[PDB]
Amino acid sequence: MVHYKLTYFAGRGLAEPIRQIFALAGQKYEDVRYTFQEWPKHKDEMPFGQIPVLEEDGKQLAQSFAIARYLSRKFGFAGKTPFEEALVDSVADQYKDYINEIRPYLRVVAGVDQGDPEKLFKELLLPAREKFFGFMKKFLEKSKSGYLVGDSVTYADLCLAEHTSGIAAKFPSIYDGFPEIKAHAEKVRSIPALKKWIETRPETKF
Amino acid sequence: MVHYKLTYFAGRGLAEPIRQIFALAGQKYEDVRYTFQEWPKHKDEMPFGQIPVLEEDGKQLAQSFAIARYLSRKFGFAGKTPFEEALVDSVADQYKDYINEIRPYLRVVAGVDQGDPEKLFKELLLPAREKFFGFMKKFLEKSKSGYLVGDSVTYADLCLAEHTSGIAAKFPSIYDGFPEIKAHAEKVRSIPALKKWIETRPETKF
Ligand SMILES: N[C@H](CCC(=O)N[C@@H](CS)C(=O)NCC(=O)O)C(=O)O
Ligand SMILES: N[C@H](CCC(=O)N[C@@H](CS)C(=O)NCC(=O)O)C(=O)O
């Protein structure tokens, strides 16, 4: 039977939406998790010297969004029509831009860089999310479904719900001014197979 | 009949691989270009207040890679199999990461940022491309086709060839230590429909 392996750090980070695609699909996989200490010696194993990396029957696929889209297309979470799949991609790409914007914050919370999460949250994340959540609000207005694109859950939903809920665990004011984005996280995370995964996944700081 | 519009600045930049997909496909489109000056009055029309943005029969799709993939799937430049398509995505996502890395350099040459382009080329671009072209070289070694993934052009190839060609016009030392990357740009840009587009496209600074 097909074998999937996901390799990433011992954390949610860029791998988490991929783990949630597997959960929604009811698809078993090997969840390989590295400490920051163990990781470096495995760098040369990976297509771009980075993680996450998926293996399917021993074939490697790098890049978290390439991996998310590949599995979402296979399992029914990519969008309902070719144009909708593209709309899903555009939202995911806007999310990726936002994450790039807040990278200094994420590196600090992950323990990778030294810093004050609270200060970065206020100075960096709040203004970045004001712009970002503003566009997400627009997509939700258009959909009228509670999901970002179309009438059913996609990997773009998983990315957003995971991010916002993850930050809100530490800094709940992320949702201030944006009750729609809170509603979205709680809608997505209550999908039964996801709710079960969230109940049982390792507790990690990032 | 289907109608496409592409809106971007008066330049190659993020829109150019998309223009090249249309050229390869033999597909007519409305090519709309704004100078830096003319853009602000149009910002709020756009899904994320950024360009490029595609319209297909009046439906907007933003985000350059989402646009490129959508058109590539439609026209035969996305990859031949679902796994190859994902591999193509992964290369394009590494490309995007590289472009992010050299953003400070790009912004100076486009004139958006103030700086020393020669200094940034040597201190930022050369070390970034050494890592990135290293991975691209391994991909070309695997394909044995002259293309990054599989045996025919994909939008990933267009991205790389447009980038390296475009830099090389000013700083041809980008190809130093990477003859295979120069060969790749030459191969891609020699494809007939593309060669013709390159011959006729507006001459722009970026
Ligand atoms: N475009 C990114 C690149 C992945 C990335 O920045 N990888 C990090 C994981 S959060 C990593 O490998 N960190 C350790 C290292 O770069 O050596 C993606 O979405 O996968
Ligand atoms: N993730 C990018 C973002 C698009 C972007 O940075 N667009 C620039 C043009 S290169 C822009 O609209 N700049 C003008 C502005 O933001 O007002 C993409 O691939 O499309």
Numbering used by the authors:
A (entry chain A), B (entry chain G): 1 to 206
How does the study describe this entry?
The structures of two major GSTs, Na-GST-1 and Na-GST-2 from Necator americanus, have been determined using recombinant protein expressed in and secreted by Pichia pastoris. GSTs are homodimers that catalyze the nucleophilic addition of reduced glutathione to various diverse electrophilic substrates consequently facilitating their inactivation, and extrusion. GSTs are a major detoxification system for helminths, which have limited detoxification enzymes and apparently lack the cytochrome P-450 dependent reactions. The fundamental/active units of both structures are homodimers with the classical GST topology of Nu class nematode specific GSTs.
